[PDB]
Amino acid sequence: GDQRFGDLVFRQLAPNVWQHTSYLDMFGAVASNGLIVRDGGRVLVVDTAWTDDQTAQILNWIKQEINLPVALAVVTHAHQDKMGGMDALHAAGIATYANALSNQLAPQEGMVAAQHSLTFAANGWVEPATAPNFGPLKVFYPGPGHTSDNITVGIDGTDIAFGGCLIKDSKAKSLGNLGDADTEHYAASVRAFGAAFPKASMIVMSHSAPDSRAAITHTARMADKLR
Ligand SMILES: [Zn+2]
Ligand SMILES: [Zn+2]
Ligand SMILES: [Zn+2]
Structure with missing residues (x-):
């Protein structure tokens, strides 16, 4: 029981957090989740949709329902x-942020790079200078897992942490696409993400409902059995 704007589904997870869900038409439609965060008088979004049209529907839904300007956007990896x-x-005039490796991989992976590059310390935390005015967004690089450039986002003030494609649901029987995956360090990267946000009770991921x-x-x- 949630909203729908065009080909997208929006679900409220917190008083100021929403989950946008788009689908890719192909062995059937595949869902993909992202986050919409209201930070005071501005809106922060995490990940785009599969296409440009679907992404433009996120921004028009935000304008219709939240009526706040989107300050910045942060993507997790180059897929x-x-x-x-x-x-x-970029057409909506939104500043975009990504992992420096993601922006470097983007052309090779057939993506359009973000305007800014996020860098990370040895412990996995984002260099604050590379991520200005992120508000409640706590960005963390757990290491190579689903991809070598996959990053995760935590939301301060809430009980929500976003794992992306790095995390699968608890009832999962597989890890999805492992075509660009690092099987050796996948497990340690997952556990690092868990340690980065030790108080998160709601774990949002790309291809499942919040768990x-x-x-x-x-x-x-499941990642240990790839070591
Ligand atoms: Zn991916
Ligand atoms: Zn994915
Ligand atoms: Zn690839």
């Missing part, structure tokens, strides 16, 4: 369900 709608963000942090330990267990 089409994260970075497919980069052209829509508890049992999804973290479960994903780690």
